[PDB]
Structures are given as C-alpha cells and as structure tokens.
Amino acid sequence: MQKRELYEIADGKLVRKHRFCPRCGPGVFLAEHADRYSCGRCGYTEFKKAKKSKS
C-alpha cells in the first residue's frame, strides 16, 4: 500500500540561549560556540545538540 503521511508540527521552540555552567554560572559563562560549549574553569564541555524534530 505505502501511505505517504509527511505531516509537519508547530512546536514552541523553547531554547534558553546563553546556557551557563551550572556551578560556575555566576562568574563563569559557558563559552557558547557555534558548534558547542566549553568551560575554561572546570572543563565542562557540551555540544550544540541537534534538535531531531520530525519537522
């Protein structure tokens, strides 16, 4: 049969930009790079997680 149902979504893009480093936050921002984050202080590094949305 094969049903072609590519239906989009309207999701409230909730992304609190300027995500600090939990414990270093007040005084040490989380180095936000285009591809990831890093913390020259406690070595806390995190990647810009690709938002795998169906649409």
The answer to the question of residue 42 lying near Zn ion (CB under 5 A) is yes
- Please say whether the beta carbons of 38 and 31 come within 8 A: yes
Residues 7-26 that bind Zn ion (CB under 5 A): 21, 24
Helix (H, G, I), strand (E, B) or coil at 9: coil
Q: Is 21 annotated as a binding residue?
A: yes
Contact by Cβ (8 Å): 45, 39: yes
Which residues define the annotated binding site? Answer: 21, 24, 39, 42
Which residues define the annotated binding site for Zn(2+)? Answer: 21, 24, 39, 42
Binding site for Zn ion (CB under 5 A): 21, 24, 39, 41-42, 44
